[PDB]
Design a binder for this molecule. Structure first.
Ligand SMILES: *[C@@H]1O[C@H](CO)[C@@H](O[C@@H]2O[C@H](CO)[C@@H](O)[C@H](O)[C@H]2NC(C)=O)[C@H](O)[C@H]1NC(C)=O
Ligand code: NAG
Ligand code: NAG
Lengths: 126, 50
């Protein structure tokens, strides 16, 4: 985390107006999970104003809102099982500063979304 | 061509709004359902729970 500058994802099979594409974004209020299809750009920087991740949403099925995802490790597991998308999570402080430390902490599930779109690739937004 | 609706037409020539509902029973992660029963609670008695 350090200075954050994170939060956002873009899943899906392709990235050009074909099939659908989750956008699990965070803005300190709502982790809105929109399965609406957009057209994307190279380096969309937003917040602080300028919102240009997207161009248009055409036809979509799902929507959602919840609470946000809260020298520390932010750690997730993204899994897809027969039309159910699951996102486990954990956020733990550490004292070591080099790499992933030696220890043990299980991940406690957060959500479960019935979508039904098969996914192949993803990339992270800032 | 335009319908012309007036208060005095009889029964067969009055507006009769229609709403058609179509359901899909295909194989997918179905999400829409109906309401559920919430019968009361008992304790210390041999019962069948669901
Ligand atoms: C964080 O982003 C979400 C997603 O845009 C915002 O949620 C919207 O909130 C407004 C305010 O009532 C609603 O009218 C919209 O329907 C919501 N959804 C969308 C997609 O716009 C949320 O307001 C943002 N948080 C802050 C603090 O601005
Ligand atoms: C969305 O998908 C449907 C599925 O066939 C398609 O007919 C429609 O043109 C698409 N776009 C919109 C805006 O509905
Ligand atoms: C997703 O599934 C459909 C139908 O099963 C298939 O046509 C499509 O190629 C799949 N997407 C992949 C494999 O990325």
């Amino acid at each position: 985390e350090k200075s954050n500058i994170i939060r956002g994802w873009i899943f899906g099979t392709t990235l050009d107006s074909k099939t659908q594409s989750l956008l699990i974004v965070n803005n300190a209020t709502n982790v809105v999970i929109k399965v609406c299809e957009f057209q994307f750009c190279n380096d969309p920087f937003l917040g602080v104003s300028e919102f240009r991740v997207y161009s248009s949403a055409n036809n979509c099925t799902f929507e959602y809102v919840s609470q946000p995802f809260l020298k520390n490790l932010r750690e997730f597991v993204f899994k897809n099982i027969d039309g159910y998308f699951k996102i486990y999570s954990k956020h733990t402080p550490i004292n070591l500063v080099r790499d992933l430390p030696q220890g043990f902490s299980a991940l406690e599930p957060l959500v479960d979304l019935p979508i039904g779109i098969n996914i192949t690739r993803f990339q992270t937004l800032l | 061509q335009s319908y012309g609706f007036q208060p005095t037409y009889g029964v067969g020539y009055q507006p009769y709004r229609v709403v058609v509902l179509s359901f899909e029973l295909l194989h997918a992660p179905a999400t829409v359902c109906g309401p559920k029963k919430s019968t009361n609670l008992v304790k210390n008695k041999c019962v069948n729970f669901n």
